[PDB]
CSV table of C-alpha atoms in Angstrom, one decimal:
chain,number,residue,atom,x,y,z
A,1,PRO,CA,38.9,65.4,-30.8
A,2,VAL,CA,35.1,65.9,-30.6
A,3,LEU,CA,35.2,65.2,-26.9
A,4,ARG,CA,37.0,68.1,-25.1
A,5,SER,CA,36.3,71.3,-23.1
A,6,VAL,CA,35.9,74.6,-24.8
A,7,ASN,CA,38.2,77.3,-23.5
A,8,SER,CA,35.4,79.8,-23.0
A,9,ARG,CA,37.0,81.3,-19.8
A,10,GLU,CA,33.4,82.1,-18.7
A,11,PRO,CA,32.9,81.0,-15.1
A,12,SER,CA,30.1,78.6,-14.0
A,13,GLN,CA,29.2,77.7,-10.4
A,14,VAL,CA,28.5,74.0,-10.2
A,15,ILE,CA,27.3,71.6,-7.5
A,16,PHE,CA,28.8,68.0,-7.6
A,17,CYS,CA,26.5,65.8,-5.6
A,18,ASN,CA,27.3,62.1,-5.2
A,19,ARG,CA,24.1,60.2,-4.7
A,20,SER,CA,26.0,57.0,-5.4
A,21,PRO,CA,27.3,54.5,-2.8
A,22,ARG,CA,30.7,54.6,-4.6
A,23,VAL,CA,33.6,57.0,-4.0
A,24,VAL,CA,33.4,59.3,-7.0
A,25,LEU,CA,36.3,60.5,-9.2
A,26,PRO,CA,35.3,63.5,-11.2
A,27,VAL,CA,37.2,63.6,-14.5
A,28,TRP,CA,37.7,66.9,-16.5
A,29,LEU,CA,38.4,66.6,-20.3
A,30,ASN,CA,40.9,69.4,-21.0
A,31,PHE,CA,41.2,71.6,-24.1
A,32,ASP,CA,43.2,68.8,-25.9
A,33,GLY,CA,40.5,66.3,-24.6
A,34,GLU,CA,42.8,64.4,-22.2
A,35,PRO,CA,41.1,63.3,-18.9
A,36,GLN,CA,42.3,65.1,-15.8
A,37,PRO,CA,41.4,63.6,-12.4
A,38,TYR,CA,40.0,65.9,-9.7
A,39,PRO,CA,39.7,65.2,-5.9
A,40,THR,CA,37.3,62.4,-5.1
A,41,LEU,CA,33.9,62.9,-3.4
A,42,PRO,CA,32.9,60.4,-0.6
A,43,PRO,CA,29.5,58.7,-1.1
A,44,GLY,CA,26.5,60.9,0.0
A,45,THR,CA,28.7,64.1,0.0
A,46,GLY,CA,28.5,67.2,-2.2
A,47,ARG,CA,30.4,70.4,-2.8
A,48,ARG,CA,30.4,73.7,-4.8
A,49,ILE,CA,32.8,73.8,-7.9
A,50,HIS,CA,34.3,76.6,-9.9
A,51,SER,CA,34.2,75.5,-13.5
A,52,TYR,CA,33.4,77.3,-16.9
A,53,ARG,CA,30.8,77.1,-19.6
A,54,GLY,CA,31.6,74.5,-22.3
A,55,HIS,CA,33.8,72.4,-19.9
A,56,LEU,CA,33.3,68.6,-20.2
A,57,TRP,CA,33.1,66.3,-17.2
A,58,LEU,CA,32.5,62.6,-16.5
A,59,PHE,CA,32.4,60.6,-13.3
A,60,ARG,CA,33.8,57.2,-12.3
A,61,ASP,CA,34.2,54.9,-9.3
A,62,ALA,CA,37.6,56.1,-8.0
A,63,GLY,CA,38.7,52.5,-7.1
A,64,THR,CA,37.5,50.5,-10.1
A,65,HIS,CA,37.0,53.1,-12.8
A,66,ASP,CA,33.4,51.8,-13.2
A,67,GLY,CA,31.3,54.2,-15.2
A,68,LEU,CA,28.7,56.5,-13.5
A,69,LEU,CA,25.9,58.8,-14.6
A,70,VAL,CA,25.5,62.6,-14.1
A,71,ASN,CA,21.9,64.0,-14.6
A,72,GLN,CA,20.8,60.6,-16.0
A,73,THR,CA,23.5,60.7,-18.8
A,74,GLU,CA,27.3,60.1,-19.3
A,75,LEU,CA,28.7,63.6,-19.9
A,76,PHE,CA,28.2,66.9,-18.1
A,77,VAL,CA,28.7,70.4,-19.7
A,78,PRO,CA,27.4,73.4,-17.8
A,79,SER,CA,25.6,76.3,-19.4
A,80,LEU,CA,26.1,79.9,-18.1
A,81,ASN,CA,24.5,80.3,-14.7
A,82,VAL,CA,21.2,82.1,-15.4
A,83,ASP,CA,21.6,85.4,-13.4
A,84,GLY,CA,24.1,83.6,-11.1
A,85,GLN,CA,22.2,80.5,-10.1
A,86,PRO,CA,24.3,77.3,-9.6
A,87,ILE,CA,24.1,74.4,-12.0
A,88,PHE,CA,23.4,71.0,-10.4
A,89,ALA,CA,25.2,67.7,-11.3
A,90,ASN,CA,23.5,64.8,-9.7
A,91,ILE,CA,25.9,61.8,-9.8
A,92,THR,CA,24.4,58.3,-9.4
A,93,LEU,CA,24.9,54.7,-10.3
A,94,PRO,CA,23.6,53.7,-13.7
A,95,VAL,CA,21.4,50.6,-14.0
A,96,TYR,CA,24.3,48.3,-15.0
A,97,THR,CA,23.4,45.1,-16.9
A,98,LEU,CA,23.5,42.0,-14.6
A,99,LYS,CA,26.5,40.8,-16.7
A,100,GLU,CA,28.5,44.0,-16.1
A,101,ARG,CA,27.5,44.1,-12.4
A,102,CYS,CA,28.6,40.5,-11.9
A,103,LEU,CA,31.9,41.3,-13.7
A,104,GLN,CA,32.4,44.1,-11.1
A,105,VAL,CA,31.9,41.8,-8.1
A,106,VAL,CA,34.1,39.0,-9.4
A,107,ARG,CA,36.8,41.6,-10.3
A,108,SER,CA,36.5,42.8,-6.6
A,109,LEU,CA,37.1,39.2,-5.4
A,110,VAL,CA,39.8,37.8,-7.7
A,111,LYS,CA,43.3,39.0,-8.6
A,112,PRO,CA,43.5,39.5,-12.4
A,113,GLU,CA,46.2,36.7,-12.6
A,114,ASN,CA,43.6,34.3,-11.2
A,115,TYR,CA,40.7,35.1,-13.5
A,116,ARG,CA,41.7,32.1,-15.7
A,117,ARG,CA,41.6,29.7,-12.7
A,118,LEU,CA,37.8,30.3,-12.4
A,119,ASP,CA,35.6,27.5,-13.8
A,120,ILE,CA,33.8,29.6,-16.5
A,121,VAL,CA,33.4,29.8,-20.3
A,122,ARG,CA,36.7,31.1,-22.1
A,123,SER,CA,34.7,34.2,-23.4
A,124,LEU,CA,34.1,35.4,-19.8
A,125,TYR,CA,37.8,35.5,-19.0
A,126,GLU,CA,38.3,38.1,-21.7
A,127,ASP,CA,35.2,40.0,-20.4
A,128,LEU,CA,36.7,40.0,-16.9
A,129,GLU,CA,40.1,41.2,-18.1
A,130,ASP,CA,38.4,44.0,-20.1
A,131,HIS,CA,38.5,46.5,-17.2
A,132,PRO,CA,36.4,49.7,-17.4
A,133,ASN,CA,38.6,52.3,-19.2
A,134,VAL,CA,38.1,56.0,-19.4
A,135,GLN,CA,40.0,56.1,-22.8
A,136,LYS,CA,38.0,53.2,-24.2
A,137,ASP,CA,34.7,54.8,-23.1
A,138,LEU,CA,35.7,58.1,-24.9
A,139,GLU,CA,36.3,56.3,-28.2
A,140,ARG,CA,32.9,54.6,-27.8
A,141,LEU,CA,31.3,57.9,-27.0
A,142,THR,CA,33.1,59.9,-29.7
A,143,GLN,CA,31.7,57.5,-32.5
A,144,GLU,CA,28.1,57.8,-31.0
A,145,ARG,CA,28.5,61.6,-31.2
A,146,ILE,CA,29.6,61.5,-34.9
A,147,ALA,CA,26.5,59.4,-35.7
A,148,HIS,CA,24.2,62.4,-34.6
A,149,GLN,CA,25.6,64.6,-37.4
B,1,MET,CA,-0.2,42.0,-16.9
B,2,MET,CA,0.6,38.7,-18.7
B,3,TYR,CA,3.0,36.6,-16.5
B,4,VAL,CA,5.4,33.8,-17.6
B,5,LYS,CA,6.8,30.8,-15.8
B,6,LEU,CA,10.6,30.4,-15.5
B,7,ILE,CA,11.5,26.9,-14.4
B,8,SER,CA,14.9,26.3,-12.7
B,9,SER,CA,17.0,23.2,-13.2
B,10,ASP,CA,15.8,21.9,-9.7
B,11,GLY,CA,12.1,22.3,-10.7
B,12,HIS,CA,11.4,25.6,-9.0
B,13,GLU,CA,8.6,27.7,-10.7
B,14,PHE,CA,9.2,31.4,-10.9
B,15,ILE,CA,6.2,33.5,-12.1
B,16,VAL,CA,7.2,37.0,-13.2
B,17,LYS,CA,5.6,39.8,-15.3
B,18,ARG,CA,6.1,39.2,-19.0
B,19,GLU,CA,7.5,42.8,-19.5
B,20,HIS,CA,10.0,42.1,-16.7
B,21,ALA,CA,11.1,38.8,-18.2
B,22,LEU,CA,11.7,40.6,-21.5
B,23,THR,CA,14.7,42.3,-19.9
B,24,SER,CA,16.5,39.1,-21.0
B,25,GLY,CA,17.3,39.0,-24.7
B,26,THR,CA,17.5,35.2,-24.6
B,27,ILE,CA,14.0,35.0,-23.0
B,28,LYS,CA,12.5,37.7,-25.3
B,29,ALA,CA,13.5,35.4,-28.3
B,30,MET,CA,12.2,32.1,-26.7
B,31,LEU,CA,8.8,33.7,-25.9
B,32,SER,CA,8.5,35.6,-29.3
B,33,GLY,CA,7.4,33.7,-32.4
B,34,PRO,CA,9.6,31.5,-34.6
B,35,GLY,CA,11.8,34.2,-36.3
B,36,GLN,CA,9.7,37.1,-37.8
B,37,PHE,CA,6.2,35.5,-37.6
B,38,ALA,CA,5.0,36.4,-34.0
B,39,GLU,CA,2.7,33.2,-33.6
B,40,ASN,CA,2.6,30.1,-31.3
B,41,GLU,CA,4.1,32.6,-28.8
B,42,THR,CA,4.7,30.3,-25.7
B,43,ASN,CA,4.2,31.0,-21.9
B,44,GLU,CA,6.8,28.8,-20.1
B,45,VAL,CA,10.6,28.7,-20.3
B,46,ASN,CA,12.7,25.8,-18.9
B,47,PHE,CA,16.4,26.1,-17.9
B,48,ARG,CA,18.1,22.7,-17.7
B,49,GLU,CA,21.3,24.4,-16.3
B,50,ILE,CA,20.3,27.3,-14.0
B,51,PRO,CA,19.4,26.4,-10.4
B,52,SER,CA,16.8,28.0,-8.2
B,53,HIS,CA,19.1,30.2,-6.1
B,54,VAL,CA,20.4,31.7,-9.4
B,55,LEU,CA,17.1,32.1,-11.3
B,56,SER,CA,15.5,33.7,-8.2
B,57,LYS,CA,18.4,36.2,-8.1
B,58,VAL,CA,18.0,36.8,-11.8
B,59,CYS,CA,14.3,37.6,-11.5
B,60,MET,CA,15.1,40.1,-8.7
B,61,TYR,CA,17.4,41.8,-11.2
B,62,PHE,CA,14.5,42.0,-13.8
B,63,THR,CA,12.4,43.8,-11.1
B,64,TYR,CA,15.3,46.1,-10.2
B,65,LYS,CA,16.0,46.9,-13.9
B,66,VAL,CA,12.4,47.8,-14.7
B,67,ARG,CA,11.9,49.8,-11.6
B,68,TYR,CA,15.2,51.9,-11.7
B,69,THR,CA,15.9,52.2,-15.5
B,70,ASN,CA,15.0,55.7,-16.8
B,71,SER,CA,14.2,56.6,-13.1
B,72,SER,CA,14.8,60.2,-11.8
B,73,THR,CA,14.6,58.8,-8.2
B,74,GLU,CA,18.2,57.9,-7.0
B,75,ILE,CA,19.4,54.3,-7.9
B,76,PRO,CA,20.7,51.8,-5.3
B,77,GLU,CA,23.5,49.2,-5.9
B,78,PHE,CA,22.4,45.8,-7.1
B,79,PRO,CA,23.8,43.4,-4.4
B,80,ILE,CA,25.5,40.1,-5.1
B,81,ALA,CA,26.9,37.7,-2.5
B,82,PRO,CA,30.3,36.3,-3.4
B,83,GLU,CA,28.8,32.7,-3.3
B,84,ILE,CA,26.5,33.3,-6.3
B,85,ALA,CA,28.7,35.8,-8.2
B,86,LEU,CA,30.3,33.1,-10.5
B,87,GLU,CA,27.0,31.2,-11.3
B,88,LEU,CA,25.0,34.5,-11.7
B,89,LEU,CA,27.6,35.8,-14.2
B,90,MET,CA,27.2,32.7,-16.3
B,91,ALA,CA,23.4,33.0,-16.2
B,92,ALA,CA,23.6,36.7,-17.1
B,93,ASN,CA,25.9,35.9,-20.0
B,94,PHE,CA,23.5,33.2,-21.2
B,95,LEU,CA,20.4,35.3,-20.8
B,96,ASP,CA,21.8,38.5,-22.4
B,97,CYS,CA,20.8,40.9,-19.6
C,1,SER,CA,29.1,112.7,0.0
C,2,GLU,CA,30.0,114.6,-3.2
C,3,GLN,CA,33.2,112.5,-3.4
C,4,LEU,CA,31.4,109.3,-2.2
C,5,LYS,CA,29.1,109.6,-5.3
C,6,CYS,CA,32.3,109.7,-7.4
C,7,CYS,CA,33.5,106.5,-5.7
C,8,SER,CA,30.3,104.9,-6.7
C,9,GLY,CA,31.0,105.9,-10.4
C,10,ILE,CA,34.4,104.2,-10.1
C,11,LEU,CA,32.9,100.9,-8.9
C,12,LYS,CA,30.3,101.2,-11.7
C,13,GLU,CA,33.2,101.3,-14.2
C,14,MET,CA,34.9,98.2,-12.6
C,15,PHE,CA,31.6,96.3,-13.0
C,16,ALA,CA,31.3,97.3,-16.8
C,17,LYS,CA,31.3,94.7,-19.6
C,18,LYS,CA,34.4,96.1,-21.2
C,19,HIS,CA,36.6,95.2,-18.2
C,20,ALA,CA,34.7,91.9,-17.6
C,21,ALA,CA,37.4,89.7,-19.2
C,22,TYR,CA,39.7,90.5,-16.3
C,23,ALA,CA,37.3,91.9,-13.6
C,24,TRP,CA,35.1,88.8,-13.0
C,25,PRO,CA,37.3,87.1,-10.3
C,26,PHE,CA,36.7,90.1,-8.0
C,27,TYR,CA,33.0,90.5,-8.7
C,28,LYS,CA,31.9,88.4,-5.6
C,29,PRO,CA,33.5,87.2,-2.4
C,30,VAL,CA,36.0,84.4,-2.6
C,31,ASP,CA,34.3,81.0,-2.4
C,32,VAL,CA,36.9,78.8,-0.7
C,33,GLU,CA,34.9,75.6,-1.2
C,34,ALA,CA,34.3,76.2,-4.9
C,35,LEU,CA,38.0,77.0,-5.4
C,36,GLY,CA,39.2,74.3,-3.0
C,37,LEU,CA,41.4,76.5,-0.8
C,38,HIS,CA,42.1,75.0,2.6
C,39,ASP,CA,44.3,78.0,3.7
C,40,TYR,CA,42.8,81.2,2.2
C,41,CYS,CA,41.1,82.5,5.4
C,42,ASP,CA,44.3,81.8,7.5
C,43,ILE,CA,46.5,83.8,5.1
C,44,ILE,CA,43.9,86.5,4.2
C,45,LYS,CA,42.9,88.1,7.5
C,46,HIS,CA,40.4,90.5,6.0
C,47,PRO,CA,38.9,89.4,2.6
C,48,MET,CA,37.3,91.8,0.2
C,49,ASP,CA,35.4,91.9,-3.2
C,50,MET,CA,33.6,94.4,-5.4
C,51,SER,CA,30.1,93.3,-4.3
C,52,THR,CA,31.0,93.8,-0.6
C,53,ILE,CA,32.4,97.3,-1.4
C,54,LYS,CA,29.2,98.1,-3.3
C,55,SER,CA,27.0,97.2,-0.3
C,56,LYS,CA,29.3,99.1,2.1
C,57,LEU,CA,28.8,102.2,-0.1
C,58,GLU,CA,24.9,101.8,-0.1
C,59,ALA,CA,25.2,101.6,3.8
C,60,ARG,CA,27.1,105.0,3.7
C,61,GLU,CA,29.8,102.9,5.7
C,62,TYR,CA,32.8,104.7,4.1
C,63,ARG,CA,33.7,107.8,6.1
C,64,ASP,CA,35.5,109.4,3.1
C,65,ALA,CA,37.0,108.5,-0.3
C,66,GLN,CA,40.3,107.4,1.3
C,67,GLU,CA,38.5,104.6,3.2
C,68,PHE,CA,36.8,103.5,-0.1
C,69,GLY,CA,40.2,103.3,-1.8
C,70,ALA,CA,41.7,101.4,1.0
C,71,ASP,CA,39.1,98.5,0.6
C,72,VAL,CA,39.6,98.5,-3.2
C,73,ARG,CA,43.4,98.3,-2.6
C,74,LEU,CA,42.9,95.6,0.0
C,75,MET,CA,40.9,93.5,-2.5
C,76,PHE,CA,43.9,93.7,-4.8
C,77,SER,CA,46.6,93.3,-2.2
C,78,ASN,CA,44.9,90.2,-0.9
C,79,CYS,CA,45.1,88.6,-4.4
C,80,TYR,CA,48.8,89.6,-4.8
C,81,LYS,CA,49.5,88.2,-1.3
C,82,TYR,CA,47.9,84.8,-1.6
C,83,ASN,CA,49.1,84.1,-5.2
C,84,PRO,CA,52.6,83.6,-6.8
C,85,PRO,CA,53.7,86.6,-9.0
C,86,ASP,CA,53.4,84.5,-12.3
C,87,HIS,CA,49.8,83.5,-11.6
C,88,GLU,CA,47.1,84.3,-14.1
C,89,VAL,CA,44.7,85.9,-11.6
C,90,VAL,CA,47.5,88.2,-10.5
C,91,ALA,CA,47.7,89.6,-14.1
C,92,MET,CA,43.9,90.1,-14.1
C,93,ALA,CA,44.1,91.8,-10.7
C,94,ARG,CA,46.7,94.3,-11.9
C,95,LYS,CA,44.7,95.0,-15.1
C,96,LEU,CA,41.7,95.9,-13.1
C,97,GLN,CA,43.7,98.0,-10.6
C,98,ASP,CA,45.0,99.9,-13.6
C,99,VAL,CA,41.4,101.0,-14.2
C,100,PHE,CA,40.8,101.8,-10.6
C,101,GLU,CA,44.1,103.8,-10.0
C,102,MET,CA,43.5,106.0,-13.1
C,103,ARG,CA,39.9,106.9,-12.0
C,104,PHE,CA,40.8,107.3,-8.3
C,105,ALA,CA,43.7,109.7,-9.3
C,106,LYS,CA,41.3,112.0,-11.2
C,107,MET,CA,39.1,113.0,-8.2
C,108,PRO,CA,38.7,116.7,-7.3
D,1,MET,CA,5.9,53.9,-2.2
D,2,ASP,CA,5.7,50.4,-3.7
D,3,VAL,CA,6.7,47.2,-1.8
D,4,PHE,CA,8.2,44.2,-3.7
D,5,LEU,CA,7.3,40.6,-2.9
D,6,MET,CA,8.1,37.0,-3.4
D,7,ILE,CA,4.8,35.0,-2.9
D,8,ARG,CA,6.0,31.4,-2.3
D,9,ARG,CA,4.2,28.0,-1.9
D,10,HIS,CA,6.0,24.6,-2.3
D,11,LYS,CA,8.2,25.0,-5.5
D,12,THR,CA,6.1,28.0,-6.8
D,13,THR,CA,7.5,31.6,-6.4
D,14,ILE,CA,5.7,34.7,-7.7
D,15,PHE,CA,7.4,38.1,-8.2
D,16,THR,CA,4.9,40.9,-7.8
D,17,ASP,CA,4.7,44.4,-6.4
D,18,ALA,CA,2.0,46.3,-4.4
D,19,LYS,CA,1.6,49.5,-2.3
D,20,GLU,CA,2.1,49.8,1.4
D,21,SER,CA,-1.5,51.0,1.6
D,22,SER,CA,-2.8,47.8,-0.2
D,23,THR,CA,-4.5,45.3,2.1
D,24,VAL,CA,-3.7,41.5,2.4
D,25,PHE,CA,-7.0,40.9,0.5
D,26,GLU,CA,-5.9,42.6,-2.7
D,27,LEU,CA,-2.7,40.5,-2.5
D,28,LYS,CA,-4.9,37.4,-2.4
D,29,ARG,CA,-6.7,39.0,-5.4
D,30,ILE,CA,-3.4,39.3,-7.3
D,31,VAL,CA,-2.7,35.6,-6.5
D,32,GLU,CA,-6.2,34.7,-7.7
D,33,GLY,CA,-5.5,36.4,-11.1
D,34,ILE,CA,-2.2,34.4,-11.5
D,35,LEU,CA,-2.9,31.0,-9.9
D,36,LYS,CA,-6.7,30.8,-10.4
D,37,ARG,CA,-7.6,30.3,-6.7
D,38,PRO,CA,-10.0,32.5,-4.8
D,39,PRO,CA,-9.0,34.6,-1.7
D,40,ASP,CA,-11.2,32.3,0.5
D,41,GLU,CA,-9.1,29.3,-0.5
D,42,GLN,CA,-5.9,31.4,0.3
D,43,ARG,CA,-3.8,32.0,3.4
D,44,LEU,CA,-0.9,34.5,3.5
D,45,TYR,CA,1.9,34.6,6.1
D,46,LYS,CA,4.9,36.8,7.0
D,47,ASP,CA,7.2,34.0,8.3
D,48,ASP,CA,5.2,32.2,11.0
D,49,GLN,CA,2.5,34.8,11.5
D,50,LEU,CA,-0.8,34.6,9.6
D,51,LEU,CA,-2.0,37.9,8.0
D,52,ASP,CA,-5.5,39.3,8.6
D,53,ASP,CA,-7.3,40.1,5.3
D,54,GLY,CA,-8.1,43.6,6.6
D,55,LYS,CA,-4.6,44.8,7.6
D,56,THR,CA,-2.5,46.8,5.1
D,57,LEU,CA,0.9,45.5,4.0
D,58,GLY,CA,2.5,48.4,5.7
D,59,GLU,CA,0.6,47.4,8.9
D,60,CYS,CA,1.9,43.8,8.5
D,61,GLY,CA,5.5,45.2,8.5
D,62,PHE,CA,6.2,45.3,4.7
D,63,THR,CA,7.9,48.7,4.0
D,64,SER,CA,9.7,50.2,0.9
D,65,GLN,CA,12.9,49.8,3.0
D,66,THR,CA,12.2,46.1,3.9
D,67,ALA,CA,10.8,45.1,0.5
D,68,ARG,CA,13.0,46.4,-2.3
D,69,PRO,CA,13.0,45.4,-6.0
D,70,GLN,CA,16.6,43.9,-5.6
D,71,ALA,CA,15.8,42.3,-2.2
D,72,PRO,CA,12.0,41.5,-2.0
D,73,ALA,CA,10.2,40.4,1.1
D,74,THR,CA,8.7,36.8,1.3
D,75,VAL,CA,5.0,36.2,1.7
D,76,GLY,CA,4.0,32.6,2.7
D,77,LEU,CA,1.1,30.9,0.8
D,78,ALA,CA,-1.2,28.0,1.7
D,79,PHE,CA,-4.1,26.6,-0.3
D,80,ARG,CA,-7.2,24.8,1.0
D,81,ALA,CA,-8.2,21.4,-0.5
D,82,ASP,CA,-10.7,18.7,0.8
D,83,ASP,CA,-12.1,21.9,2.6
D,84,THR,CA,-9.2,22.6,5.0
D,85,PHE,CA,-6.0,24.6,4.7
D,86,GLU,CA,-2.7,22.7,4.2
D,87,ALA,CA,0.3,23.6,6.4
D,88,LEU,CA,2.5,26.3,5.0
D,89,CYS,CA,5.4,24.6,3.3
D,90,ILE,CA,8.0,26.5,1.2
D,91,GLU,CA,10.7,24.3,-0.5
D,92,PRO,CA,14.0,26.2,-0.1
D,93,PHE,CA,16.1,27.3,-3.1
D,94,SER,CA,19.2,25.3,-4.1
D,95,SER,CA,22.4,26.1,-2.2
D,96,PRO,CA,25.3,27.9,-3.9
D,97,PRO,CA,28.5,25.8,-4.0
D,98,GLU,CA,31.3,26.5,-1.4
D,99,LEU,CA,33.3,29.6,-2.5
D,100,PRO,CA,36.1,28.9,-4.9
D,101,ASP,CA,39.7,29.4,-3.5
D,102,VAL,CA,40.8,32.2,-5.8
D,103,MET,CA,37.7,34.2,-4.6
D,104,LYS,CA,38.8,34.1,-0.9
């Protein structure tokens, strides 16, 4: 896979900082490119992290798997610390589309087996059922990456 | 700063910045010329279906979106009351935003 | 002071780029937050690293070479103590200690 | 920072922004640009209370925290006609329906 950590074994001091109101799940893509969950960060909290150069991270709502940003973009890979200075990862909400944001709220209020008992267009039921998925996001991101080459 | 008028189904007039209103793909098309010739570009859009409580909330989104998109300054949650969630979702879908 | 200069030479070797592939976990003090270790400081009563040893040398804090060796051996012992024998960092610790023990042995 | 506003009279509602340091007069100037009515024929209110032209919006109680993009603050508007000011009247937005059962 294009989307995976490099096994550089070169350490990199990192700060995860959650400037989202969500509980954040950091996700590490391993050497095979499979996502590994790491302990969650409460909203407003940060901590120092021992990672390595070339290692690939992304961030999600720990409850809903909603997608989040890190340094204004989707993936995080740290360079070598320059003379041992930590690398900052500023985790935030993205500006969701009003559609996606409304999907979030309705999901939070309705059991999935009741989606189809809402008085709405048939097309939105599918949209509601289409939960945010780390695996689906990776296929979307992988194709985007292949288009830069 | 050109403005435009968005009229709700119950006759409420919302005047918003044109660049803000363009957040909607549906509105961008309705304001922009017929097809590829950008002429007889209009200045009002009427929504026979969307009521005032929903179009007001939609316009708040356009402001939020412009202000916070591509912004280095930390981004807050866009708030939605349960009571408007279903109607707002249908608007959003209709408006492509 | 003759032999303390030699102790400084040993540390210099431990810091060298050739040993870096195994020496880097001991370069600086253990960062328990970074590493996510709730229990390190409970189990390890007296932590140690290469940087701390370097600074103690510069402060002429080591009475003799035996006291320098005891802190280098403490750094390693602490790693062996906290980790299981099959752990990767244990292998790296033993590989660096190999370097240390050889140099420390040849000291007039 | 900026403050974000709904300027509302009868069934008209204007979404515009201004600074805390801006005065009420400038806000009347913004309204003049949009609705073609001079600041002399205009009256602005935070709820009940009439706003002095001189006072800054910050002074009137409009802050970045109270007047956010996603949750703007309301400014009441009255025009003059037959050379006296009408009463402030803002028609309320439609009600949402009662919450569907599967959402409770």
